[PDB]
Design a binder for this molecule. Structure first.
Ligand code: LPA
Length: 241
């Protein structure tokens, strides 16, 4: 089956990037071409939809250091991104609300992709959502987390997007979200492009979809702009004013 590969990234505006990402999710109609989107964000902390900013991050350190706060539309915990972090989102038709199985199948895809790069990894073991590593939504290179993910479902559509640490500043990560995380490049000598290419092939093989490069539609673009103008660009959305 043919998919859409969207190489669609606004690294200098994380809030707009997130607007793009709900936009593609919400524009999706059951039976549409499944979407695989790759993107990076400059220095940024992205918190879960339901999180209290000042409980989860050092907002004073962040402002002092020019790190953008951005709230995403999926739940889950807070993460630090920079240009060393590769993000990706998968939107597909859905006939059920079995989110566990979604994470399971996307993690298989990620594991297959990393195998291509010579890196052995598994999904974490634990259900406890509050713990920092080894969750079933994490991907673990042994004891170290190298990737986390969040997702959402509605009638007819699912979304699952993930942040992979390729060559992220792990010291900035630890400072802003206040030994357990690692970069992919701590294990194998690879570029972001090589990682992206492995993920394309791995997701294609695992999901049996051929993701061909495409652009966003006028409808997807206009919704993203609306979501940004009315929501993602605002302090109320991000800070929860
Ligand atoms: O590590 C976690 O537990 C949450 C991962 C959230 C991934 C999002 C991908 C696009 S924005 S941040």
């Amino acid at each position: 089956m043919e998919g859409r590969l969207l190489l669609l990234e606004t690294p200098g505006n994380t809030r707009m990037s997130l607007a793009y990402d709900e936009a593609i999710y919400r524009s999706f109609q059951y039976g549409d071409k499944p979407i695989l989107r790759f993107y990076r964000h400059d220095r940024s902390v992205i918190i879960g939809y339901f999180q209290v900013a000042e409980e989860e991050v050092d907002l004073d350190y962040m402002k002092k250091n020019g790190i953008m706060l951005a709230r995403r539309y999926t739940g889950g915990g807070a993460v630090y991104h920079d240009l060393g972090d590769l993000n990706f989102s998968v939107v597909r038709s859905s006939d059920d609300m079995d989110i566990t199985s979604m994470f399971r199948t996307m993690n298989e895809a990620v594991v297959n992709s990393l195998r291509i790069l010579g890196l052995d990894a598994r999904p974490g073991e634990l259900n406890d959502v509050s713990i920092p590593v080894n969750k079933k939504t994490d991907i673990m290179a042994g004891e170290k987390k190298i990737m986390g993910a969040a997702g959402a479902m509605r009638k007819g559509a699912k979304l699952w997007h993930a942040a992979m640490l390729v060559h992220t500043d792990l010291d900035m990560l630890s400072a802003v979200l206040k030994e357990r995380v690692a970069n992919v490049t701590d294990f194998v000598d690879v570029s972001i492009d090589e990682v992206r290419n492995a993920l394309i092939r791995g997701f294609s093989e695992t999901l049996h979809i051929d993701f061909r490069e495409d652009t966003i539609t006028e409808k997807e673009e206009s919704l993203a702009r609306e979501l940004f103008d009315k929501k993602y660009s605002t302090e109320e959305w991000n800070m929860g004013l």
